[PDB]
């Protein structure tokens, strides 16, 4: 089964439960109360993103059963996103203890510091769901 998992094809679309593009202008005060519990953990000592953050946010919730079936934990997904998009995107993911697997995404700090700050998120989310390979 390990070889079968390593051979078959799995896309963020397969391991993602849902996606939502929130505004969330202030990361410290997240629009999502559930997020605010653990997002503040990362934003208490933020690194590589204190300079600037794009106002928009892309929240993706991942299916626990699919994640366990493909042996895909919360780490390598963010690592793959980082490798694919360079520093273009900042990814902050919750812990497996939480019943909901959440991965907030924002655009790079430099661009914030041309297409669209909003529609570009729809572009990346759909390409991540289909084109990207986990």
């Amino acid at each position: 089964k390990d070889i079968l998992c390593r051979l078959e094809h799995t896309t963020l679309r397969k391991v993602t439960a849902n996606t939502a593009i929130y505004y969330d202008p202030n990361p410290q005060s997240t629009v999502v109360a559930e997020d605010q519990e653990w997002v503040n953990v990362y934003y208490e000592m933020p690194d590589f993103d204190v300079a600037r953050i794009s106002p928009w946010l892309l929240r993706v919730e991942l299916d626990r059963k699919h994640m366990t079936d493909r042996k895909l934990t919360m780490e390598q997904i963010a690592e793959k996103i980082n490798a694919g998009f360079g520093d273009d995107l900042n990814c902050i993911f919750n812990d497996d203890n939480a019943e909901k697997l959440v991965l907030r995404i924002r655009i790079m700090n430099s661009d914030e510091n041309k297409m669209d700050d909003d529609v570009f998120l729809r572009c990346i989310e759909s390409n991540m769901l289909t084109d990207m390979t986990l």
Binding site: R13, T16, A17, N18, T19, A20, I21, Y22, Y23, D24, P25, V31, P55, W56, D63, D117, D118, R122, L129
Partner: protein
């Protein structure tokens, strides 16, 4: 999720942030109109989409003569013994064998699942 229409020309309102105040405004196009976006969530899609089929079920199906009728599942709302049970038979379910029950008593369109 909500869709807002311009009050001036009744056109679709698209989301735009205002850098001056850093708040979401549903701004009209070809109209030069703006509104304050209270909901905040502009887009959301559920891939799993565990939609409650009871919402799709229509109480009028109790009048269908071709649907099976069982008296072993009385209606909770009114206690009526007779009820009509059927499968979803709706695509995207990818597992459709459970039975949805609808009360056969007129004026009581109660629907449930076991």
């Amino acid at each position: 999720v909500g869709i807002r229409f311009c009050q001036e020309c009744n056109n679709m309102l698209y989301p735009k942030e205002d850098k001056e105040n850093r708040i979401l405004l549903y701004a009209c196009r070809n109209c030069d109109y703006q509104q304050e976006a209270d909901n905040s969530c502009i887009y959301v899609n559920k891939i799993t989409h565990e939609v409650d089929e009871l919402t799709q079920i229509i109480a009028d199906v109790s009048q269908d003569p071709t649907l099976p009728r069982t008296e072993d599942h009385p209606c909770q709302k009114c206690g009526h013994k007779e009820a009509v049970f059927f499968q979803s038979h709706s695509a995207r379910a990818e597992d459709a064998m459970r039975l949805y029950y609808v009360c056969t008593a007129p004026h009581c369109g109660h629907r449930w699942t076991e």
